[PDB]
Design a protein around this ligand. Structure first.
Ligand code: GTP
Ligand code: GTP
Ligand code: GDP
Ligand code: GDP
Lengths: 54, 433, 428, 434, 428
């Protein structure tokens, strides 16, 4: 039971650390995206650098 | 010789199966692949293809591919014979109807065919354990068609059912009420005993006892497995008072259409809470009757116990059982009906509950009780209210009558269940003559 | 395996579909040129819901690009995911709908619908078990209303047991990009009622309100609006496409949210949406998802849910989550707000959970709601129609192209009679 | 075999139990981790025994508000207690008998008595319950009183002994002790089998005078109360010449059914650098109890007469030096007994010396706890009577209780019951004339 | 676990709250970025009374900052502890109250009340056992009076069993800051009577008396005045948030200091207050704390308690200290001054002892007192209202925003009807 209790505590600690890493990854992927960045290069048309996707 | 064909039907059934089959494989040794890493106890659940492969004796059925297609790509891809896993290319859409009249009677053929093969390789079928969900297409529809068709072939052979009764408050569906009432109607003369387990209660058990503040099906599912492995523990291990799968019927279902036993595992404690309890035969027995360690949200004091089946396992001295059972009878709260004095089918196996890399702790003793209380009347009545609450404006019924269910079957259903509510009353009043 | 055939009509429908195909290709790992290059093996198990096989390991979307004018032609080809669609399914017309339901329904639209339907056959009998069609269009204006409703009627009478999800952008009173559009919306609702099984009404007012009040953009554009739409477009059909516990697909959603065949109009919502400067303040959990799911600022229709009782609510979640907490959040929403939910449907919230979240995220979810509060939309379009039809304004175009005053009267009568059961079941 | 369950209600009672169980674990040898050190029934009465020698106290630590239980479950003795035995609500009673007894008592009484019957199931012979609280705070008044009501209707054949922190006649700690004490006493008068009071101003006096501690704390105060409860519940934990029991306490201290109110004092409260210079003979220990200054309820006994005294000697006490010393107590004129108790003493002797916790008190070999039911307590009850009358003359703090769910008329019969108690305490007082 | 939602109304409320969160983050170990840089476990143990969890260990205050002008909230954000509050709790107005109670209570204040009340349901619903709400506002002037009392009314109507604490800045007797303060104060005391569980009346003249005579500074700032305000503000809620002996939370304070529901207007006091030059010579002990706290010099409402009898007194001490001196000193100050306490409440002082002191200090105490002598303030504002309303002063602006001539009369009548029992209970 003690070995089980220490293993469960370690599992919860590792899960919290993994969840925090996933949270920071989510924050970075939405900060660096297109909806929440207003990149002027979203309008890079495939027809050339003179046209834009309207 | 003590075989038990097990049909799992629906996300619920198939997913509870993952848990049940894990526990079975980590107890008998059968490794995830299908070979016991370098003696005949597995013949109650697995087989032997004269080579060293131990194939499960089961048919997992789900009209939706997603679920079963993760068991044919997971760490058990081999154990299950490809065929056993049977799927379809379209769900039932939470519509009992499209599971008992349309996209469901198109797979009864294949399933009954497989049930036959797995049953012709048995030298003593003890019964068919069916795991489903009272709410849901395949869980209600297919289970209904299956139970019926089974009766036509396998005559009066036991057909014990394990189920997730519609919860008293949560309920992840607006149509749950309809499916649950229609199910009982079709399966009220075709089911021998139907063990019940509600998610709302297992959630509570998984917070006041297991300290998992955030339960996930995997947790709840595994707890239900320990129950199935206790109901089927005397058929593969030794004991002092064994219990078969054809005895729960003649020791829990009192009058005809009253087969709804509730389940309760006693030592559902956590590692950091077992370093404080002696978990003794007495302690665990009183725990099963405590109106909190129950598993079908329904206060047992709101009714009267009709019959009990305490299935024990571990270091349980036969005399400590007599002691505890006696002390329970003395207490008043636990009120047993008058027409049932002897109200305890006691059974004691020896294999100490197996610990699966999971949540529950390493306990030496355990007791899984099966009660047929008349307090399940409130459950049937709450479900009944919801059926009416919507059947008045004929709500969500176009979906059912546009597949093959005459709208009148809803009335025949409500009527049948009204008799059941009234039945649960007559079999509770005590003769004063 | 279950397939969804994606139809796009109009400029609005074409651009929403282009953003939708971009974001779904980002989720499954398909690059612009069509081949798969991702990280997970779970992105190929159910890729045959939107993508057909091709030689050389090339995945091609099953989209039917329809418009009556060849400029959306150039727009969706000049988009970043332009060289991914079939040129043969990419049908166009040498005409102009001209903000005219008559010119979308009884004209060159009815001449192009033959080729459109032929492409629909080419992509529909090339399947083994097809679930339905998913048409994206705008109710206000031409093409997406006229061609949209005509194609709806033809596909419904061709395949009667398959589910037609329409994502309809409905006109708004605050800002109008068309003077005639009450006429088009009034005519289009009549065919939307007795046909489609799931209608998602999306309003540009509410799209900009989410883009400005919640996400706090500086220059929100049509691409951002269409991305807000396509998040729910992808999140509705996600248990059909990625595994999970309580997998719910389109039919299960339709069964649990449509109590009566005319009450299939919904109000979508998607709720991991936070501002750039307030995103590091987040405490992102299941209660936060339910919070931002259930407020009257995340709705993408211009209908406040406090003005009408919820008939049904469905929430399709994504990520690794606890079923106890999801069920508890839905239960406490129902219990705390009891006046805003009808009492003849107990437990009127459906929960779905998918395990795999969208890429770049950890935990997402989508709202669908069949609500009484969509009275306001159909009523305001009705008074605008009666104001413009009392004096026969803008009607010579319709009558010259082949309409009738009795046809307009019947469209308004059927739309007001759609306004009636949403009154009587909100009033019990 | 001979076990009794300890319930600790309120912050006061929880720190009571902290000091008491620290003393119990030190004297029985129990480590703070629960396990016995490597090198049989003595602990069995107050401690359970699961598995490989894990001893869990037979106690429940109930409070309606956190952080006082959290000090227990975070600090030194975290592992000793079962984490479910410590019971905690989420909202404070906030010094209301009404909030302790009517609204936030129902959220925890089912859990509390569920765990009480869990403890009682693993009890072959249950002696009774020891109920540690105060007549002050809302938890320790209201939840204690409702606990007495449901404990009486559930386990009525068992004994219920009470350790009540009586409110000081002068200083107090709040403004609603006059309400709380009367309101809990009216409804616990017929349910509590015995009720030993301990004051706190008097332990201030004792710690200042005999203990040479000018700056005492609650550590000192109910560590002395821990010493008293270890003095009275020791004959069943060890062996003795007079093995006195908790069942005998009520019979030898409660003459009339309403008069169940003894006062406690402890002898050798001496302070290490005062104890090498004095013999601490049994005459000394039995005279220090009957001095009118070592009594730990601030009420002089000479304003009244003793009904009965239970003396409990501990250590190297001679079983006949004790009665040769009791003879002088009987012959002293200043100590006056009632005419209807010619025998007014109960002697309890055990051979276990007092156990010295790291702290102030000295290594002593002779001790006695004296429990007297006296008529003097009618004076302190009249002080509480006058205070309640002063508050209730024009309804001070009454809205707090009447808007709580408690009726306004409850104070009326709570006062009439108290008046009847005073009439009983004076009717027992005068000498015989018939 | 218990929770407190903090509300700030007005410029004064925002500045007081800014300094309050400065010293609370100082007290718990929260840097301006927001994460925990501390030195003890007890500081983090009960950080969930004021601070919500967020990602990355970034505790965020549950403060709703309210002003009808967005001018001082920008200064709050640009202050030292500025990037710590939510941008969504940061509710402002595109108008001006203009220090008009009608414009705070019956106009655009009642339009912005909805946004504030949505935010505070978010902050109350992100809880499971809330204890109550804590509004800081200035009684004189607009916003904090008008909007503040309106907010108090809606919160008290919706949450009936939660403790409302209101730190109210009452205008000085000697100096005057915004000429319509008797209008604002008499109009807002009427709601403060009928709404709040606890009101802490504070005065800038008494604050300056402390800062000039007790603190002996030369050039004090409003930073230091709100530092004193927030010193007693954090001193009140210390047993709720840190361990101790005789723990007393806000409901305990309410119960043991209101004998009658009218007299919930308290006078606070913080008294380990010693200058830089005299801090070296001080002999810090519990009798010195008690005399400095009970002296009529550290009083923070400008009403001398020598002129009235104390009804109830609460003292919350802080630090490692022996209980015998605390009890003995409270009994001694009850005994030495006998005519300064009422006779119908024996032992009329409550003691609380919190374990952890404010750092930089060894031993501290805070005062709360329900003195009868607070009637000096109320008679003064009453005569200021009567002698100014007699000639209909400043009144067209009060009656044109939506009042009537009657509306002032029952406000002054209720203020006199509170003046009456705090004569009767002072004269037994
Ligand atoms: N233990 C367990 N219970 C489940 C699981 N899935 C569902 N349930 C319960 O079963 C009820 C309905 O689920 P199902 O009957 O499996 O749904 P279905 O049969 O797949 O039918 P569809 O919803 O149309 O896909 C839910 O309300 C749950 O309470 C599961 O994976 N494990
Ligand atoms: N040894 C010791 N004695 C205490 C302690 N706390 C309180 N006492 C005594 O108990 C009396 C009343 O405190 P309580 O009855 O516990 O107050 P409460 O039960 O916590 O009720 P609430 O204030 O609502 O939380 C005080 O006057 C003290 O004399 C303590 O922590 N240790
Ligand atoms: N969500 C979204 N809506 C759009 C987009 N482009 C246009 N709309 C809406 O579509 C409405 C009119 O479209 P319409 O002229 O009828 O396009 P047509 O069907 O080709 O004639 C406008 O009022 C826009 O608000 C887009 O890219 N995304
Ligand atoms: N303690 C304290 N009081 C202040 C501060 N700033 C202003 N006050 C007081 O607040 C009163 C005026 O506030 P007011 O103008 O009504 O703020 P408003 O509610 O935004 O209109 C003045 O009498 C000041 O004495 C401060 O920073 N600290």
């Amino acid at each position: 039971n003690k070995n089980q209790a220490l293993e469960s505590a370690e599992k919860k600690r590792q899960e919290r650390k993994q969840e925090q890493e996933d949270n920071l990854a989510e924050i970075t992927n939405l900060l660096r995206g297109d909806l929440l960045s207003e990149d002027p290069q979203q309008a890079a048309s495939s027809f050339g650098p003179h046209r834009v996707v309207p | 010789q003590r075989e038990c064909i097990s049909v799992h039907v629906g996300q619920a059934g198939v997913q509870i199966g993952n848990a049940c089959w894990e526990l079975y494989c980590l107890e008998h040794g059968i490794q995830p692949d299908g070979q016991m890493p370098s003696d005949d106890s597995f013949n109650t659940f697995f087989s032997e293809t004269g080579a060293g492969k131990h194939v499960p004796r089961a048919v997992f059925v789900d009209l939706e591919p997603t679920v079963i297609d993760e068991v044919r790509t997971g760490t058990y891809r081999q154990l299950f014979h490809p065929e056993q896993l049977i799927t379809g290319k379209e769900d039932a859409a939470n519509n009992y109807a499209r599971g008992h009249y349309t996209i469901g009677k198109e797979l009864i053929d294949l399933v009954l065919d497989r049930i036959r093969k797995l049953a012709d390789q048995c030298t003593g079928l003890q019964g068919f354990l069916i795991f489903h969900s009272f709410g849901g297409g395949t869980g209600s529809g297919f289970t209904s068609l299956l139970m019926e068709r089974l009766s036509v072939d396998y005559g009066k052979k036991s057909k014990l059912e394990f189920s997730i009764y519609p919860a008293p408050q949560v309920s992840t569906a607006v149509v749950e009420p309809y499916n649950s009432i229609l199910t009982t109607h079709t399966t009220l003369e075709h089911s021998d005993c139907a063990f019940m387990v509600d998610n709302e209660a297992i959630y509570d058990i998984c917070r006041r006892n297991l300290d998992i503040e955030r339960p996930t099906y995997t947790n709840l599912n595994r707890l239900i497995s320990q129950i199935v492995s206790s109901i089927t523990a005397s058929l593969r291990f030794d004991g002092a008072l064994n219990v078969d799968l054809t005895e729960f019927q003649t020791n829990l279902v009192p009058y005809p259409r009253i087969h709804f036993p509730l389940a309760t595992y006693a030592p559902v404690i956590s590692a950091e809470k077992a370093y404080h309890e002696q978990l003794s035969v007495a302690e665990i027995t009183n725990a099963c009757f405590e109106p909190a360690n129950q598993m079908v949200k329904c206060d047992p004091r709101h009714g009267k116990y009709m019959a009990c089946c305490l299935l024990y396992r571990g270091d349980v001295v036969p005399k400590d059982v007599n002691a505890a059972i006696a002390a329970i009878k003395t207490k008043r709260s636990i009120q047993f009906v008058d027409w049932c004095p002897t109200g305890f089918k006691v059974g004691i196996n020896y294999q100490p509950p197996t610990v699966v890399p999971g949540d529950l702790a390493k306990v030496q003793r355990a007791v899984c009780m099966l009660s047929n209380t008349t307090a399940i009347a409130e459950a049937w009545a709450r479900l009944d209210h919801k059926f009416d609450l919507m059947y008045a404006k004929r709500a969500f019924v176009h979906w059912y009558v546009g597949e093959g269910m005459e709208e009148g079957e809803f009335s025949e259903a409500r009527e049948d269940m009204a008799a059941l509510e009234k039945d649960y009353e007559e079999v509770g009043m005590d003769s004063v003559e | 395996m279950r397939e969804i055939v994606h139809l796009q009509a109009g400029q609005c429908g074409n651009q929403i579909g282009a953003k939708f195909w971009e974001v779904i290709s980002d989720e499954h790992g398909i690059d612009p040129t069509g081949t798969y290059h991702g990280d997970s093996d779970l992105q190929l198990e159910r890729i045959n819901v939107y993508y057909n096989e091709a030689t050389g390991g090339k995945y091609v979307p099953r989209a039917v690009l329809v418009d009556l004018e060849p400029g959306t032609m150039d727009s969706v080809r000049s988009g970043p995911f332009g060289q991914i669609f079939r040129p043969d399914n990419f049908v166009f017309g040498q005409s102009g709908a001209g903000n005219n339901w008559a010119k979308g329904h009884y004209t060159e639209g009815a001449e192009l619908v033959d080729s459109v339907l032929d492409v629909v056959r080419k992509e529909a009998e090339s399947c083994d078990c097809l679930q339905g069609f998913q048409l994206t269009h705008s109710l206000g204006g031409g093409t997406g209303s006229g061609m949209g409703t005509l194609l709806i009627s033809k596909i419904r009478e061709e395949y009667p047991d398959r589910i037609m999800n329409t994502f309809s952008v409905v006109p708004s009173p605050k800002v109008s990009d068309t003077v005639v559009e009450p006429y088009n919306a009034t005519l289009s609702v009549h065919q939307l009622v007795e046909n489609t099984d799931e209608t998602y009404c999306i309003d540009n007012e509410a799209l900009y309100d989410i883009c400005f009040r919640t996400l706090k953009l500086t220059t929100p554009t049509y691409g951002d609006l269409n991305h807000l739409v396509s998040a729910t477009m992808s999140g509705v059909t996600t248990c059909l496409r990625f595994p999970g516990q309580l997998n719910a697909d389109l039919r299960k959603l339709a069964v649990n949210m449509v109590p009566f065949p005319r009450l299939h109009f919904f109000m979508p919502g998607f709720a991991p949406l936070t501002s750039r400067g307030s995103q590091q303040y987040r405490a992102l959990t299941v209660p936060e998802l339910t919070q931002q799911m259930f407020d009257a600022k995340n709705m993408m229709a211009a209908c406040d849910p406090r003005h009408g009782r919820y008939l049904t609510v469905a929430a399709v979640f994504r990520g690794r989550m606890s079923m106890k907490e999801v069920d508890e959040q839905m239960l406490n929403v129902q219990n705390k707000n009891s006046s805003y939910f009808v009492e003849w449907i107990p437990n009127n919230v459906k929960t779905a959970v998918c395990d795999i979240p969208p890429r770049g995220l950890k935990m997402s979810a989508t709202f669908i709601g069949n609500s009484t509060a969509i009275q306001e939309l159909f009523k305001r379009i009705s008074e605008q129609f009666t104001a413009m039809f009392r004096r026969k304004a803008f009607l010579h175009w319709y009558t010259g192209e082949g309409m009738d005053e009795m046809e307009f009267t019947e469209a308004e009568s059927n739309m007001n009679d759609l306004g009636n059961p949403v009154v009587t079941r909100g009033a019990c």
